[PDB]
């Protein structure tokens, strides 16, 4: 019944983390865990990214989630217009329901905020992620 | 034809590495690259492993391969007597062909040395690994 050894054997799944590449791979690594998949599709050609990357270093919350989840880096035409409708821009913090389904339509409280990726919007960014990895239904 | 940017973008695959678990997963991650699979099955209950673990820290060669390949940690009955015949002991540095086949029968020059895992046998250990990740045939 009850567990044992109050100390996580493996210490930390993403104890180190890695530079993942290609969507599928990202999907599989998560698939093996049968858990929600988080993948921040980003690039650097657009100073825009450099914006989030700023507070990103201080927003320990972001990391905590970026390190314990999946990561993707794609700066070349590949995301077929079938994988994401308006997801044509850069800031594309996408998520995938347990079934490995890219539920990009996953919003939060103020769906009107997660549109203007402000240098300090980490609030919604974090809530969303924190919300994406949180189920709400199972039997109902 | 020729490549580009003399600086590997990813700057490293297992740049950070991770504490993998369960055979399958090991095969999974390896298969994603369709390359030879290296998995050092070990435990710590037996002071034996502690031996290799000694020079292991200095034998940069071992690491170099342990970091750029697969890793497995199993200290509980699981390796069915079908996965490895005499592989019942501890020092079980197993390998898997690109087809994800656990070719445990992979020996080296002195097949009589890799039997007595000496505190300094790293010589064969390294040669073997270095040899396991090296093909010899394709068309013939």
UniProtKB/Swiss-Prot annotation, chains A, B:
GO molecular function, one term: dystroglycan binding
Thylakoid keyword on record: no
GO terms classed as biological process: digestive tract morphogenesis; inflammatory response; lung goblet cell differentiation; mucus secretion; positive regulation of cell-substrate adhesion; positive regulation of developmental growth; positive regulation of epidermal growth factor receptor signaling pathway; positive regulation of gene expression
Phenotype upon changing residue 82 to Y: In RIFTD; decreased interaction with MUC2
Localization in the cell: Secreted; Endoplasmic reticulum
Main location: secreted
GO cellular component terms attached to this protein's record: endoplasmic reticulum; extracellular region; extracellular space
Organism domain of life: Eukaryota
Motif (Homodimer stabilization): 10-19, 25-32
Keyword field: Disease variant, Disulfide bond, Endoplasmic reticulum, Proto-oncogene, Secreted, Signal
Free-text tissue specificity from the UniProt record: Expressed strongly in trachea, lung, stomach, colon, prostate and small intestine. Expressed weakly in pituitary gland, salivary gland, mammary gland, bladder, appendix, ovary, fetal lung, uterus, pancreas, kidney, fetal kidney, testis, placenta, thyroid gland and in estrogen receptor (ER)-positive breast cancer cell lines.
Assembly and binders: Monomer and homodimer. Interacts with LYPD3 and DAG1 (alphaDAG1). Interacts with MUC2; disulfide-linked.
Family designation: Belongs to the AGR family.
Function: Required for MUC2 post-transcriptional synthesis and secretion. May play a role in the production of mucus by intestinal cells. Proto-oncogene that may play a role in cell migration, cell differentiation and cell growth. Promotes cell adhesion.
Disease per record: Respiratory infections, recurrent, and failure to thrive with or without diarrhea: An autosomal recessive disorder characterized by neonatal onset of recurrent pulmonary infections, coughing, wheezy episodes, interstitial lung disease, and bronchiectasis. Episodes of vomiting and chronic diarrhea result in failure to thrive. Results of sweat chloride and pancreatic elastase tests are normal.
Name of protein: Anterior gradient protein 2 homolog
Organism per entry: Homo sapiens (Human)
Residues of the full protein shown: 41 to 175 of 175
